[PDB]
């Protein structure tokens, strides 16, 4: 089948530059345009335009004008798109348009990459977890997070298997600037708040989960 | 321009759901009803304005009248809730524009009520004299945001942050808002009770200074 590739998530500065790469392969290469849209989070999706597989001529949309600039390489086989004076509001995911469906005509845009993410962020974390007393209840009303926490897609949780289990994963609030990834695993049991495993936190600058120390003590 | 289509449906399951797509340039261009399941790609449901791709079950229909296009879906499943959208071209043909999007969704998450549990403050924010407690909801239908942390107390609107109503696991959705207070305003107040609103409840966690 046609198989469709976009690149890894980048996130840059506002005012930067930005590069990501759409792959296509595995349909007839005489004339198959690929479309590029843009969707904010919770919004409507928006069309940036549409690029030659191998004709060359290209169209861009009559909103977006001059930091527009769809550049594909034929024997690549790969479609590179330069967008100059990166904005707030161009925080958003980028999709790709191609076609597969078998009862012929273009302007159905039938598959769809994994898209590529774009969001502009620093990067923080936070230590303890919590020092409070151990609850009555079964239940952690403290666990491993990290507070104030600007690095995007943070993933605060224990090092070990322990407290995993259970855990609601926290949302991202980011009322300030910092994005205070909370990242909030709570090990839902009394005997696990008394003794919890330290608390990983990975955040934006190391992708790895660098190991660091988040404990109940309950 | 711009097609318009309602934001939003709320359709019972067992009953036909019709989404409205409207332009001037319509009755002279094809749509493309597109289906976009919460966090994955969009995939054709409709294409033509009247047939389906294949894999496409029966249920979806698409029809054209005037300067309006209808997608019916008769006997709406529990899977069905999505995002659709129409897809057209405008006057000059050359520009490719989507609609707005109708959020389909069946009659509704597991109600329940409000819960509220204040973290403790950390060692680390009591030294940096910014004690806080955050309260995370663990699930509930259709939660509302509201935060109100009353530590000693009214509402502060610094003392707690609004947050997204995430999806929750279990057929829910999980609310966690982050709320951060200074540490001589906990110290002032007696207790840190903060009370987080979701799901048409509140519920207030309590905490000793």
């Known amino acids: 089948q046609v198989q469709l590739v976009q690149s890894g998530a980048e996130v840059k500065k506002p005012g930067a530059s930005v590069k990501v790469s759409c792959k296509s392969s595995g349909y007839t290469f005489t004339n198959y345009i690929i479309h590029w849209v843009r969707q904010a989070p919770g919004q409507r999706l928006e069309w940036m335009g549409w690029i030659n597989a191998g004709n060359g001529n290209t169209k861009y949309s009559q909103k977006f004008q001059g930091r527009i600039s769809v550049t594909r390489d034929t024997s690549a086989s790969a479609a590179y798109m330069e967008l100059s004076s990166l904005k707030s509001e161009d925080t958003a995911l980028y999709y790709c348009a191609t076609l597969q469906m078998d009862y012929g005509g273009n302007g159905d845009l039938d598959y769809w990459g994994q898209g590529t993410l774009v969001t502009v962020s620093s990067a923080s974390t936070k230590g303890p977890s919590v020092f409070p007393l151990a609850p009555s209840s079964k239940s952690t009303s403290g666990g491993t997070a990290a507070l104030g926490c600007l690095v995007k897609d943070y993933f605060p949780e224990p090092v070990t298997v322990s407290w995993n289990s259970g855990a609601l994963t926290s949302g991202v609030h980011t009322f300030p600037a910092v994005l205070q990834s909370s990242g909030l695993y709570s090990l839902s049991s009394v005997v696990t708040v008394p003794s919890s495993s330290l608390g990983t936190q990975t955040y934006i600058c190391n992708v790895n989960h660098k190991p660091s120390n988040t404990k109940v003590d309950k | 321009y711009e097609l318009t289509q309602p934001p939003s449906v709320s359709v019972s399951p067992g009953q036909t759901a019709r989404i409205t797509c409207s332009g001037d340039?319509?009755?002279?261009?094809?749509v493309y009803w597109y289906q976009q399941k919460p966090g994955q790609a969009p995939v054709l449901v409709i294409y033509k304005d009247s047939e389906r791709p294949s894999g496409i079950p029966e249920r979806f229909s698409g029809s054209s009248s005037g300067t309006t296009v209808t997608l019916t879906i008769s006997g709406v499943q529990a899977e069905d809730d999505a995002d659709y959208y129409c897809?057209?071209?405008?006057?000059?043909?050359?520009?490719?524009?989507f609609g707005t999007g109708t959020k389909v969704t069946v009659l509704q998450p597991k109600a329940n009520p409000t819960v509220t549990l204040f973290p403790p403050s950390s060692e680390e924010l009591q030294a940096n004299k910014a004690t806080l407690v955050c309260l995370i909801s663990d699930f509930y239908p259709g939660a509302v945001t509201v935060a109100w942390k009353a530590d000693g107390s009214p509402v502060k609107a610094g003392v707690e942050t609004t947050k997204p109503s995430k999806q929750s696991n279990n057929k829910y959705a999980a609310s966690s808002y982050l709320s951060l207070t200074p540490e001589q305003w906990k110290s002032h107040r007696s207790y840190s009770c903060q009370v987080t609103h979701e799901g048409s409840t509140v519920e207030k966690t309590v905490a000793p200074t």
């Open positions: 340039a319509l009755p002279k261009q094809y």
């Open positions: 897809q057209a071209a405008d006057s000059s043909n050359t520009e490719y524009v």
